[PDB]
Design a protein around this ligand. Structure first.
Ligand code: CLA
Ligand code: CLA
Ligand code: CLA
Ligand code: CLA
Ligand code: CLA
Ligand code: CLA
Ligand code: KC2
Ligand code: KC2
Ligand SMILES: CC1=C(C#C/C(C)=C/C=C/C(C)=C/C=C/C=C(C)/C=C/C=C(\C)C#CC2=C(C)C[C@@H](O)CC2(C)C)C(C)(C)C[C@H](O)C1
Ligand SMILES: CC1=C(C#C/C(C)=C/C=C/C(C)=C/C=C/C=C(C)/C=C/C=C(C)/C=C/C2=C(C)CCCC2(C)C)C(C)(C)C[C@H](O)C1
Ligand SMILES: CC1=C(C#C/C(C)=C/C=C/C(C)=C/C=C/C=C(C)/C=C/C=C(C)/C=C/C2=C(C)CCCC2(C)C)C(C)(C)C[C@H](O)C1
Lengths: 65, 192, 34, 172, 34
């Protein structure tokens, strides 16, 4: 295996292979953020789909000017 | 444990059928009415934590519809028009009062409301529902506190039913707690 | 808040309280019981 | 057994080593980040705020003649353009390079967090007086960080400066 | 007329230290997770 300056510079970034946090770790936080992302995607989809009409959000070409 | 006769073993007076097994003398105010065995899979510590907080909101909510049809504070009258109790949860969200009663309550629950359940779930010493608030020590006297713990929960178990009733009765007919007692008939049906 | 936004939020609440909460309650209640 | 909140347990790493400790770490920020870095930040924010609060009060009562008279927050805008803003940013940044060197020292454990060793007028005579004052600073920084946020938001709404608003409450 | 021996990092490594000033300062290490 060749050793290089860039290889030694970036070596700690590729050093902790297989290192894991115990148990579930931050899984509830990930699930909560995924739920927020799903709600956001639903909001933007229904805005584009015109099933959700917020005020001052005219989904139309005529809104360009 | 205020008295075994009021709560705990031998005080299961539903035709006993033994006693919901998880339920036992230890939990406060247990007569063993657990038809659906909720205790069976559940963490009665979240279960006990969950009942007292629903009870405390309701006794406070209930004192409220009753002391609201009977009183309105300096002002209120000019704003809020003069409105029945659900309308307030629709006008208030806009006068802004409520939204600044969800800010501070959210601040309350996040900072102290959520760690305390995790500690009770974690095996921390605090009993489900103990926030250690006893500014005047009615609690201090050990004997009376045991009576209060059975008292607190029973009134809360009563209030949650009453406040649920007050809200159910008013939408169908009448206005508020005091007036619904006031007009017995389905004679006038003021709209919500 | 358009009537459309109100329908959206209540749709989120109903999905939570009619689909997610009842089904999830049942799985925890029967999983723990068996 | 947190003293401030009897119910919650003391967060594990808030043990009173740093002064100002009432165990109030409900959301457990202490465990995730190094406490020493956090104390540095408490005081550094506090220090800006404890000063800014003085300024909103002083800027309102008096302004130097060469600058146009403006409300305290308005100025963030004139000064972005007169160019005073850059000067106050350049210097506060210069002081901060030394601050990065100071922090790295705290992480290596060779500096008490928040100590720049500035006591020119030598007010701190004894190790107790230091503990008394050191607590006072931590309390004022906490009060001030709250109050500066207030002075600004109340102006964003009342469009009145803090002393003027106190004089004419002008309730919403 | 002091003259330190300086038995230390070669000149090029020092230029790297000076470059590491601008691409690897210790500002964000302080916020490392534990
Ligand atoms: C018709 C039959 C019958 C009879 C005679 C009783 C009689 C009684 N029940 Mg009831 N109960 C019954 C059916 C009956 N139960 C059924 C079918 C259920 C639902 C499973 C319950 C659920 C129930 C609860 C939850 C409680 C009682 C309690 C009591 C006792 C009241 C003691 C007190 O003042 O408090 C009393 C002996 C109370 C008790 O025993 O407290 C000491 C009490 O808290 N009962
Ligand atoms: C949401 C409020 C709430 C909560 C969390 C509890 C929780 C509890 N109660 Mg309490 N209780 C309540 C309301 C509540 N109760 C009310 C309103 C009454 C008056 C009827 C009582 C009367 C009562 C008695 C008399 C006794 C209990 C007991 C218990 C414990 C065992 C039962 C269990 O595991 O079910 C947990 C509860 C749930 C999982 C809620 C499920 C609700 C379902 C899903 C919908 C119900 C809708 C309804 C039928 C309409 C547990 C700590 C027993 C005890 O002390 O054991 C320690 C006992 O003897 N409760
Ligand atoms: C579940 C509890 C609950 C909830 C959600 C509300 C919610 C509301 N109340 Mg009610 N209220 C409550 C309990 C509650 N109150 C209690 C216990 C009392 C008796 C003191 C009152 C007496 C009361 C009056 C007289 C009025 C309201 C009004 C209102 C509305 C505006 C908020 C306000 O100014 O409150 C003011 C309420 C208080 C300052 C009392 C709160 C203090 C209690 C003791 C809680 C403290 C907890 C800790 C000890 C809002 C819809 C107003 C309204 O819109 O009427 C049309 C109004 O005029 N409330
Ligand atoms: C039926 C009402 C009732 C009863 C008997 C109790 C009883 C008790 N509570 Mg609970 N509590 C209640 C309602 C009640 N509480 C309500 C409505 C709330 C929400 C505000 C709370 C919130 C609460 C917390 C957060 C804590 C308690 C605690 C306690 C215990 C010690 C405090 C004490 O002795 O106060 C006795 C209380 C009374 C005799 C009520 C008097 C009614 C007053 C005078 C009028 C209303 C207030 C008025 C504006 C002033 C005791 C078992 C503590 C505990 O568990 O310690 C072990 C605790 O940490 N309670
Ligand atoms: C102690 C409680 C109590 C009392 C005194 C009454 C009294 C009355 N009810 Mg009843 N009612 C009660 C509880 C009670 N109810 C409960 C708990 C429920 C829910 C199940 C009902 C459900 C109910 C219905 C569905 C109706 C009544 C009606 C009536 C009135 C019939 C005569 C009339 O119209 O006015 C005569 C005097 C003027 C009468 C005043 C009837 C009514 O008002 O007609 C529209 C009617 O249709 N009630
Ligand atoms: C940004 C400012 C800041 C920072 C970095 C700290 C940092 C610290 N504080 Mg201090 N503190 C502050 C502001 C701050 N505090 C203010 C304003 C108050 C007055 C309420 C206090 C009161 C206080 C006490 C009483 C104690 C501490 C303690 C501590 C230490 C451990 C707790 C911790 O990790 O907090 C981390 C804090 C943050 C990450 C900032 C919060 C950021 C959140 C996520 C955003 C929302 C915050 C929002 C303003 C609060 C909700 C308000 C709501 C209306 C939205 C740590 C050195 C403890 C100590 O001395 O231990 C050494 C201790 O006992 N603090
Ligand atoms: C601590 C007791 C107290 C409570 C719990 C309370 C709650 C609320 C709520 C519910 C959240 C609203 C919405 C509300 C609004 C107004 N209050 Mg306030 N208020 C309280 C105390 C006083 C006093 C002493 C006065 C007063 C006033 C007004 C005016 C008048 C301006 C107008 O003319 O429009 C308005 C709109 C004055 C008044 O008219 O009272 C005769 C005045 O002297 N209030 N108030
Ligand atoms: C579990 C929830 C609940 C509770 C805890 C509860 C307690 C009490 C108490 C306290 C002990 C009294 C004194 C009382 C009195 C009356 N209740 Mg009542 N009540 C509850 C629920 C309902 C529903 C769903 C209805 C209803 C009615 C009436 C009428 C009829 C007058 C009329 O016919 O006009 C009267 C006099 C009906 C009504 O509101 O008509 C639209 C109706 O359908 N209630 N209610
Ligand atoms: C502790 C704890 C927690 C917490 C917490 C909290 C409550 C944290 C709150 C922290 C706060 C509020 C920090 C605020 C800092 C304010 C600053 C730095 C203001 C600087 C202003 C400047 C520089 C200015 C200015 C100005 C001047 C002077 C005049 C003008 O002409 C111009 C200008 C506008 C430029 C919680 C519960 C979350 C969890 C946890 O478990 C433990
Ligand atoms: C603010 C807001 C609103 C709102 C709202 C609110 C506050 C709604 C709250 C409603 C509540 C609290 C309903 C609960 C009623 C009580 C019930 C069903 C239990 C009865 C007891 C039974 C059946 C048996 C008991 C018993 C047991 C267990 C068995 C044996 C015997 C016995 C003792 C009888 C809206 C939604 C209207 C919309 C508006 O835009 C804004
Ligand atoms: C963007 C902008 C700028 C700006 C700006 C600035 C400086 C913005 C900064 C705003 C600040 C600092 C807001 C502070 C919020 C603090 C809160 C809510 C904490 C309160 C304390 C609590 C809740 C205590 C709770 C507690 C109490 C005692 C009891 C319970 C326990 C405990 C939790 C301890 C300009 C002005 C420069 C102009 C430019 O054109 C644009």
């Amino acid at each position: 295996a060749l050793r290089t300056r860039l290889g030694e510079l970036l070596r700690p970034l590729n050093s902790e292979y297989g290192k894991v946090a115990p148990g579930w770790g931050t899984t509830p936080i990930m699930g909560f953020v995924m739920l927020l992302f799903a709600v956001f995607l639903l909001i933007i989809l229904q805005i584009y789909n015109s099933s959700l009409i917020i005020e001052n959000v005219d989904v139309d070409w005529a809104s360009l000017g | 444990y205020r008295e075994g006769v009021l709560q705990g073993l031998g005080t299961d007076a539903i035709p006993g059928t033994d006693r919901p097994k998880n339920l036992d003398g230890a939990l406060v105010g247990d007569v063993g009415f657990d038809p659906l065995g909720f205790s069976n899979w559940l963490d009665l510590r979240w279960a006990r934590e969950a009942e007292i907080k629903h009870g405390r909101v309701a006794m406070l909510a209930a004192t409220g519809m009753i002391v609201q049809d009977v009183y309105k504070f300096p002002g209120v009258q000019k704003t809020f028009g003069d409105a029945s109790m659900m309308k307030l949860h629709n006008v208030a969200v806009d006068q802004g009062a409520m939204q600044q009663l969800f800010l501070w309550i959210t601040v309350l629950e996040t900072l102290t409301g959520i760690p305390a359940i995790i500690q009770t779930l974690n095996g921390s010493e605090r009993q489900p529902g103990d926030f250690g608030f006893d500014p005047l020590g009615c609690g201090r006297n050990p004997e009376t506190l045991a009576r209060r713990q059975l008292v607190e929960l029973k009134n809360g178990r009563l209030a949650m039913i009453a406040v649920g009733g007050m809200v159910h009765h008013y939408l169908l007919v009448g206005r508020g707690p005091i007036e619904f007692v006031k007009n017995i008939p389905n004679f006038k049906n003021p709209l919500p | 808040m358009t009537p459309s936004f109100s329908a959206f939020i209540n749709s989120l609440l109903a999905g939570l309280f009619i689909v997610i909460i009842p089904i999830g309650t049942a799985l925890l209640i029967v999983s723990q019981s068996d | 057994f947190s003293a401030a909140v009897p119910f919650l347990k003391r967060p594990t790493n808030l043990d009173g080593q740093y002064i100002g400790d009432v165990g109030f770490d409900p959301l457990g920020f202490s465990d995730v980040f190094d406490l020493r870095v956090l104390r540095e930040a408490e005081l550094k924010h506090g220090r800006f705020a404890m000063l800014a609060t003085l300024g909103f009060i002083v800027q309102e009562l008096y302004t130097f003649p060469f600058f146009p008279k403006m409300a305290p927050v308005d100025a963030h805008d004139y000064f972005v353009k007169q160019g005073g803003g850059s000067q106050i940013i350049f210097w506060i940044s210069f002081v901060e390079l030394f601050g990065v060197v100071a922090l790295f020292e705290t992480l290596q454990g060779k500096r008490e967090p928040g100590d720049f060793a500035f006591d020119p007028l030598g007010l701190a005579k004894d190790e107790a007086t230091l503990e008394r004052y050191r607590l006072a600073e931590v309390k004022h920084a906490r009060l001030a960080m709250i109050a500066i946020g207030g002075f600004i938001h109340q102006y964003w709404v009342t469009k009145q400066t803090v002393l003027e608003q106190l004089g004419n409450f002008k309730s919403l | 007329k002091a003259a330190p021996e300086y038995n230390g990092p070669s000149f090029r490594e020092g230029l790297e230290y000076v470059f590491s000033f601008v691409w690897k300062p210790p500002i964000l290490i302080a916020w490392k997770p534990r």
